[PDB]
């Protein structure tokens, strides 16, 4: 029962520079990281995250690496800079899922009321929406198996909190507020 959050792409630029790390460290092609934040209501806001040094075997794909040298003492750091912005979830790229996502969620679920695997978009060419959320679910079936845990589409958006446009709307240098009904509507018609 979660609709939408508020997204600061600042730590998505941290996703960008960890996307710079993975292009020059080694065999890790995809960007996998950990998404801090704070449940505020069904609407939510995120202020920080971090990016795990992660590896994943192509053979028996349930091979995660989430170091507690990189979790616990960096959690002490992120707790020392603020007590508010603690864990709320994690993130990896692609749109779909890999297999180990369920266990990577359940690892940090012990810290959080609802850890979220927001699947993130580094090379955006998509047809729908950007990065999107998934909440802990128990839907199992009408058949009655042991309890299902594959985290279902419980959506998200890219919300805008507050000011930051000192940076952003000076960094635009191109764009314009269309006085709606001035081919903005047919941009929307196209899309």
């Amino acid at each position: 029962a979660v609709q939408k959050v508020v997204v600061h792409p600042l730590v998505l630029l941290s996703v960008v520079d960890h996307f710079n790390r993975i292009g020059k460290v080694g065999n890790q092609k995809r960007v996998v990281g950990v998404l801090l934040g704070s449940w505020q209501k069904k609407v939510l806001d995120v202020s920080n995250s971090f990016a795990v040094p992660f590896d994943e075997d192509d053979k028996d794909d349930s091979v995660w690496f989430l170091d507690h040298d990189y979790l616990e003492n960096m959690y002490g750091m992120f707790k020392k800079v603020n007590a508010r912005e603690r864990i709320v979830g994690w993130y990896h790229t692609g749109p779909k899922l890999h297999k180990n996502d369920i266990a990577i969620n359940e690892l940090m679920k012990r810290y959080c009321p609802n850890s979220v695997l927001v699947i993130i978009d580094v090379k955006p060419k998509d047809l729908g929406l950007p990065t999107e959320a998934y909440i802990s679910v128990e839907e199992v079936h009408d058949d009655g198996t042991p309890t299902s845990k594959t985290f279902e589409h419980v959506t998200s958006e890219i919300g805008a909190e507050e000011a930051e446009e000192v940076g952003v709307e000076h960094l635009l240098r191109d764009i314009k507020d269309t006085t709606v009904g001035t081919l903005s509507q047919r941009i929307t018609n196209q899309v």
Binding site: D143, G144, T145, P146, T147
Partner: protein
């Protein structure tokens, strides 16, 4: 106590093919293959005399073995109950072994489902609700055992036979059908269970979309050798009315528990005929006349109003029925279960939608083309 199986060793001819090995198991002192030797004394047809004596050594296992899960101990009291034929000492003995044999695993669920399984000698509806409910109180965490969910079906199905919810056998039969998906016993007993499944889901009515999971393989592979019109009357409530001999063959052949609410069964032919008549024709004239209703729904003019006000109580269709022309108006409905030929041939609506709203999008944009600007 080694002398105990020195005197109780020989238990038949060819039974010392596991007892000459058992006289060295406890010298090797092992308990994995001796837990499996309890399971193998279950497997080989023991007439309950080695276990009914070794039960004091099972107390001794609880005394100085103190590591193995009491799975086999619950097994061995419910296999000494053939020597016993009395559960009233076995209940206190089993909760004794619950509170005196420790493990880290889920044990309260296996203990209370074994109490549910041997509860049939109690005269039910008195202790069933309490501890059968306690089982699902401790089922939320992790049903990883899931033979405890099978025994939970069995106590829940004798709890269905504690009368009161006559189509909870269908959802409970989903718990049976997914307790273990492979049916792990031969075809005949459970195809008679599929026989009485069709019956006990047919005649009672808490369920309303009764013709639903008939496509499921583990029941229709049982039905393929059943009587050849129980399949067809389940199809008469799957398709929904138009098998007159079958929606009447429920009144021809299947007699027990029929005549109490076959009027409600023929109420559901009408409830299902509504979704039939407004689905199978996609077209308009959704202010339908009452005529097909009163012809094929075996209803009268004075009862079409009840036919759809009882459906307002149902809540799958909520028509704004005309009453100056007496026309039974079609609004939104709950459509079907599966039309796989129309899951394939929905292209005439889906690709219709896709390319035609796409083309008319291109046409609106093509008439407002060069104000791209």
């Amino acid at each position: 106590v080694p002398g105990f199986l020195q005197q109780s060793q020989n238990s038949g001819p060819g039974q010392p093919a596991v007892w000459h090995r058992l006289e060295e198991l406890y010298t090797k002192k092992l308990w994995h293959q001796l837990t499996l030797q309890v399971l193998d004394f279950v497997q080989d047809p023991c007439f309950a005399q080695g276990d009914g004596l070794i039960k004091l050594y099972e107390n001794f296992i609880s005394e100085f073995e103190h590591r193995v899960n009491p799975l086999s101990l619950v097994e061995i009291i419910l296999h000494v109950v053939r020597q016993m034929t009395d559960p009233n000492v076995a209940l206190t003995f089993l909760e004794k072994t619950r509170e005196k044999v420790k493990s880290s695993d889920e044990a309260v669920i296996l203990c209370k489902t074994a109490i549910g399984a041997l509860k049939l000698n109690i005269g039910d509806l008195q202790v069933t609700k309490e501890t059968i409910e306690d089982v699902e109180e401790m089922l939320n965490n992790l049903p990883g055992v899931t033979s405890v969910h099978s025994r939970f079906y069995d106590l829940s199905s004798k709890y269905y036979q504690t009368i009161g919810n006559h189509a909870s056998y269908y959802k409970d039969a989903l718990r049976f059908l997914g307790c273990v998906d492979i049916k792990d016993l031969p075809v005949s007993e459970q195809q008679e269970r599929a026989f009485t499944l069709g019956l006990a889901g047919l005649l009672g009515e808490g369920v309303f979309n009764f013709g639903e999971l008939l496509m499921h393989p583990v029941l229709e592979s049982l039905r393929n050798t059943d009587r050849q019109w129980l399949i067809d009357t389940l199809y008469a409530f799957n398709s929904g009315n138009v098998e007159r001999f079958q929606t009447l063959k429920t009144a021809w052949g299947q007699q027990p528990d029929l005549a109490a609410n076959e009027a409600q069964l023929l109420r559901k032919i009408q409830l299902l005929c509504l979704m039939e008549m407004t689905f199978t024709r996609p077209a308009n004239h959704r202010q339908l006349t009452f005529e097909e209703i009163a012809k094929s729904a075996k209803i009268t003019v004075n009862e079409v109003e009840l036919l759809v006000m009882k459906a307002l109580s149902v809540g799958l269709v909520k028509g704004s029925i005309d009453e100056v022309d007496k026309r039974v108006h079609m609004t939104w409905v709950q459509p079907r279960v599966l039309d796989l030929q129309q899951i394939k041939g929905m292209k005439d609506r889906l690709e219709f939608w896709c390319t035609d709203v796409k083309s008319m999008e291109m046409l609106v944009e093509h008439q407002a083309h060069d104000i791209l600007t």
